[PDB]
Design a protein around this nucleic acid. Structure first.
Lengths: 67, 144, 102, 214, 135, 71, 148
RNA sequence: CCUCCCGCUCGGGAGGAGGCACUCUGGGGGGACUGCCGGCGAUAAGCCGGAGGAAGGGGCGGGCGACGGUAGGUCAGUAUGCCCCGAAACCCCCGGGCUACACGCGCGCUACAAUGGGCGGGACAAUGGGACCCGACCUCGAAAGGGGAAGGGAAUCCCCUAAACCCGCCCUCAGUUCGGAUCGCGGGCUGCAACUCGCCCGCGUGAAGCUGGAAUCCCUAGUACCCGCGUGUCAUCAUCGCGCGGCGAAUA
């Protein structure tokens, strides 16, 4: 029916680009290696998402407006 | 250059069923088509072919299998019986056409009972077939 | 020597693998030749049940799993080299069968 | 049985159901060209799953479309070689498997009389069995109209094939018209636009009632 | 010669195929391609073998064993694997892209196979409810 | 048959939906036939119709329409 | 062929059609479709041909395989009634013997005062269970044996 | 390498050595995240379209159901407040009743034939269940079943045959060779015992029904539609309940 990423997923990717912004990239797997080591892996599927948002949060930080 | 493996089962069965009339060791006993037949038949047919197909299968099946039993060949045919409005179910054939058939093959030397408890082919049952399939597989390339 | 089969099953996943791994580690080094811990099937058991005690309206129906898993181990060691390896603690709740033939 | 194997040497090469070359016909109208799988190849059964996408049902082999709107009528009851049926209907209370035979024998019975590639008589029967205009009892703004609605090439095909497949089962009804026949004598006469096709009698009436109302 | 072992799986007919060089052998579960009774699902198996050519069909021995319930099921597992058996053989993108443009049932299986029968509210089939008439 | 006049019209834009049954989808169409050429008509098109589909118009004098709207 | 007729008379004066020999005897009450093909064998005819292609000589071979079938062959479960009313070994049933033998045994029970005979008079199956609402909307089974 | 068959001597097939490749089994790991590309949108959220790819934009199917309410349902599963019974509304027993029917309805099965029936042949599964229990195989019996007896407390044995399929043959649209109610008889099987009230097998019997008004239900894809298959409970009543795979869509 409809798609929207959860707020736990956005709380987490937002502060993870806040503390260590420069240890993140515009590759998917690398951030995904880093997210693994910083905050818990309650599972595998969520660990791809947070990582999916962090990549978009590095694309927007170049632009000038990041929400 | 042929096995029972190389010939379709529609052309193999009237060539072995004839070769069961011709040889002429296996034959119809009178009691077996009359009324000692397999489950229920919409009509009972007065055929030699009827006897010669129920056996022409039996030499192909013991080829494939090892210990092929009576309870296996009764249940291997495919066919049902009514209960009523309750839907039909799966039942087995007449053991009379299967327990005289293996024994008409056993006197012919085509089948033999092994010492492990079962039913296997002899060389004479195995050669009777490979010759009849060498004739069938040869004809299947001639005919467009 | 005497070829022994350790046939080891368990009702849960975590309990069966730790014993299978530990059995292949301690036996490895002594007077034992050991063939690897082979997994056979899960005879998953389905109990398929009516929830509601009224049997009324729509009744939602529980699916049940009992999964029992079986590792198997051949080993060439004595009856004395066998008990040394059967020392291990073992989860509750892990059946260990022993056939002995030469 | 030997002709049957010639029917296995011949589809190979490439041809539908054993001996109908898929090049014999062309789609002359540029309307029914992307909506029809005349051009692609060999077997209908395919199981290529459709309706997957927006038009995941246009790429369906014309004959496969035929088979399952020819398979349609079907409840509950039980079929097997036993005593045993009906359960597979006057239109497959059951499978596309014993359906595909009917359409094959109907391609055989429509080839026997006309003598053309039957895929030139059926594709000539699904551009004529479709009405060009339809009235929907459409109300918009709370105001009840019965209106000019023109038909889309996809919803054309469907009304063509379905009305062909609806007409035959009124005739096959406890009658010598076998669907292999009753379909083969519907497909010739829907190709022709004849006054004997229960499928070209609704085509017309649906345009003619819809012209009055406009 | 060579041995290139492949697989082909559609609706749980798993085809075990082997492609070695020889003389035009077509083996299915031990029997030649001739033993099958439906003409129809044969032609399906035959589709790829002409799209490439009889040239490569004659020069190579294909034995497959399709352990799958369906008659068309067996055929379909045979259609996907021959096509993959012939794309590994020659190696080129010409024979692969020529298959994909024709149909994706030569080189993709499914993403799905079957669904369970739901518990349901006392009736028969996964997706069905008891009939109502209490209004 | 005799033709009538087949007045081919290819749709240019799909404005929204009409019918209470919902059934009509109003599509704006551009004409490519030997008589008029170019005419912009807003016709009641049913069934699945994409952008760039072809629709044989039966009568050339039509244009039924009721409009609004997304916010 | 063996001399075309459309009506030859078999089993007394009751009529043999032009449908097929195996279906023409089924009608003659007492001979069915399995018992018709048991008397085609002993007599020596082709079973699948039309009825009425019979000389006079074939019509006599059937009437003596009927009077006593247990003399010619016909197994003692493949004959019509085996072990009759506790003292006949085997017999034959035909339109007159079948009609009488079944009404006799029913005449026997009503005098006996059983729960089978009065259960064939009120209007009911005896062992088929439900009389609860079946034969529904005024309807009826017709019990035994013929509404055509 | 070795035993068997066949042969046009080219070559096809089985067995055992041999080999863990493959299928598979069950434990772990990666892969999909609007990541990228275009368009719509406040450059945000999000929606649409595209490429690569086994798979895509809740991937897909389940479990997972808040505070409460209908004084919904069950004290006749258990737990339990209150009341009532005390040779009894206790207790034991045999037999009968729940399976009575002029009828009404609900939920379903089977069905009105040529997309068919007989007969034969051939190619195919999966979940599961199996010790007074599954029963190889051999024998007798027309069969239901009986006698003997291997293996098996289980990836190693058994139920087991799938069914739909297709090919050839016979048959040639009638209330019928449809359909199987009803009735006579012969016969097995479990239990003390199947008349009331079991199922099957054989012969005879052969009913209504030849596509159904008003009205109305179910469901959106490997789904429906369709075909068989298993299990529960369990001697025995299954046209039921739960669950499996085979064929495989319409419309949205």
């Amino acid at each position: 029916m409809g798609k929207i990423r959860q707020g736990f997923i956005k709380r987490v990717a937002r502060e993870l680009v806040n503390k260590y912004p420069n240890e993140f990239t515009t590759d998917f797997e690398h951030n995904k290696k880093k997210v693994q080591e910083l905050t818990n892996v309650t599972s595998k599927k969520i660990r791809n998402r947070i990582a999916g948002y962090v990549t978009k949060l590095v694309r927007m930080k170049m632009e000038g407006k990041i929400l | 250059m042929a096995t029972v493996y190389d010939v379709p089962g529609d052309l193999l069965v009237e060539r072995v069923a004839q070769r069961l009339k011709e040889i002429p060791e296996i034959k119809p006993p009178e009691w077996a088509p009359f009324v000692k037949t397999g489950r229920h038949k919409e009509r009972l047919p007065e055929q030699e072919d009827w006897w010669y197909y129920r056996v022409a299968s039996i030499l192909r099946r013991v080829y494939l299998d090892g210990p092929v039993g009576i309870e296996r060949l009764r249940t291997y045919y495919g066919g049902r019986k009514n209960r009523g409005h309750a839907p039909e179910k799966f039942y087995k054939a007449g053991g009379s056409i299967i327990r005289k058939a293996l024994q008409q093959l056993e006197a012919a030397g085509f089948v033999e009972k092994v010492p492990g408890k079962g039913r296997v082919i002899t060389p004479k049952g195995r050669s009777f077939l490979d010759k009849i399939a060498t004739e069938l597989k040869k004809e299947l390339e001639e005919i467009i | 020597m005497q070829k022994a089969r350790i046939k080891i099953a368990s009702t849960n996943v975590r309990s069966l693998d730790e014993v299978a791994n530990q059995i292949k580690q301690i036996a490895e080094r002594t007077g034992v030749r050991m063939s690897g811990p082979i997994p056979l099937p899960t005879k998953r058991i389905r109990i398929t049940t009516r929830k509601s005690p009224d049997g009324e309206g729509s009744a939602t129906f529980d699916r049940w799993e009992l999964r029992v898993h079986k590792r198997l181990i051949d080993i060439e060691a004595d009856e004395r080299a066998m008990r040394q390896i059967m020392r291990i603690r073992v989860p509750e709740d892990v059946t260990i069968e022993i056939e002995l033939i030469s | 049985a030997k002709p049957l194997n010639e029917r296995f040497f011949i589809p190979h090469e490439i041809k539908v159901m054993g001996r109908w070359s898929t090049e014999d016909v062309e789609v002359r109208d540029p309307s029914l060209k992307p909506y029809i799988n005349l051009e692609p190849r060999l077997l209908p059964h395919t199981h290529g799953r459709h309706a997957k996408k927006h038009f995941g049902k246009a790429n369906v082999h014309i004959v496969e479309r035929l088979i399952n709107k020819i398979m349609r009528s079907g409840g509950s009851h039980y079929k097997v070689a036993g005593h045993f049926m009906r359960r597979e209907h006057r239109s497959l209370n059951s499978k596309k498997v014993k359906a595909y035979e009917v359409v094959k024998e109907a391609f055989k019975i429509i080839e026997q009389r006309t003598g053309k590639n039957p895929i030139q008589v059926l594709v000539w029967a699904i551009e004529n069995a479709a009405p060009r205009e339809d009235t929907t009892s459409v109300m918009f703004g709370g105001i009840r109209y019965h209106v000019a609605v023109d038909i889309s090439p996809m919803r054309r095909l469907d009304v063509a094939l379905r009305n062909i497949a609806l007409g035959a089962s009124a005739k096959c009804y406890r009658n010598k018209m076998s669907f292999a026949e009753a379909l083969a004598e519907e497909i010739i006469l829907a190709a022709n636009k004849d006054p004997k096709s229960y499928a070209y009698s609704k085509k017309l009436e649906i345009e003619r009632i819809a012209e009055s109302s406009r | 010669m060579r041995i290139i072992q492949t697989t082909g799986k559609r609706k749980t007919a798993i085809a075990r195929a082997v492609i070695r060089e020889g003389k035009g052998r077509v083996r299915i579960n031990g029997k030649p391609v001739e033993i099958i009774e439906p003409e129809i699902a044969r032609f399906t198996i035959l589709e790829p073998l002409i799209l490439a050519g009889e040239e490569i069909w004659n020069s190579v021995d294909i034995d497959v064993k399709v352990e799958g319930g369906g008659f068309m099921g067996q055929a379909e597992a045979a259609r996907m694997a021959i096509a993959r058996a012939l794309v590994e053989w020659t190696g080129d993108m010409s024979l692969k892209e020529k298959f994909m443009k024709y149909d994706r049932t030569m080189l993709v299986g499914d993403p799905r196979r079957t669904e369970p029968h739901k518990p349901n509210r006392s009736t028969k089939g996964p997706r069905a409810k008891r009939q109502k008439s209490y209004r | 048959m005799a033709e009538d006049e087949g007045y081919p019209a290819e749709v240019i834009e799909i404005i929204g939906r009409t019918g209470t049954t919902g059934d009509v989808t109003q599509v704006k169409v551009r004409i490519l036939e030997g008589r008029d050429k170019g005419r912009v008509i807003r016709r009641n098109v049913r069934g699945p119709v994409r952008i760039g589909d072809i629709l044989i118009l039966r009568e050339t004098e039509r244009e039924a329409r009721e409009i609004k709207s997304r916010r | 062929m063996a001399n075309f007729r459309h009506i030859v008379r078999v089993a007394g004066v009751d009529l043999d059609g032009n449908k097929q020999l195996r279906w023409a005897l089924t009608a003659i009450k007492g001979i069915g479709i399995n018992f018709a093909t048991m008397v085609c064998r002993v007599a020596g005819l082709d079973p699948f041909m039309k009825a009425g292609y019979l000389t006079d000589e074939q019509v006599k071979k059937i009437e003596e395989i009927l009077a006593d079938p247990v003399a010619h062959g016909i197994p003692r479960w493949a004959v019509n009634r085996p072990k009759d009313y506790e003292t006949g070994r085997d017999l034959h049933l035909i339109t007159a013997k079948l009609d009488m033998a079944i009404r006799e045994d029913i005449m026997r029970l009503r005098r006996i005062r059983a729960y089978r005979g009065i259960r064939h008079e009120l209007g009911l199956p005896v062992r088929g269970q439900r009389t609860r609402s079946n034969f529904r909307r005024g309807q009826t089974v017709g019990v035994s044996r013929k509404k055509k």
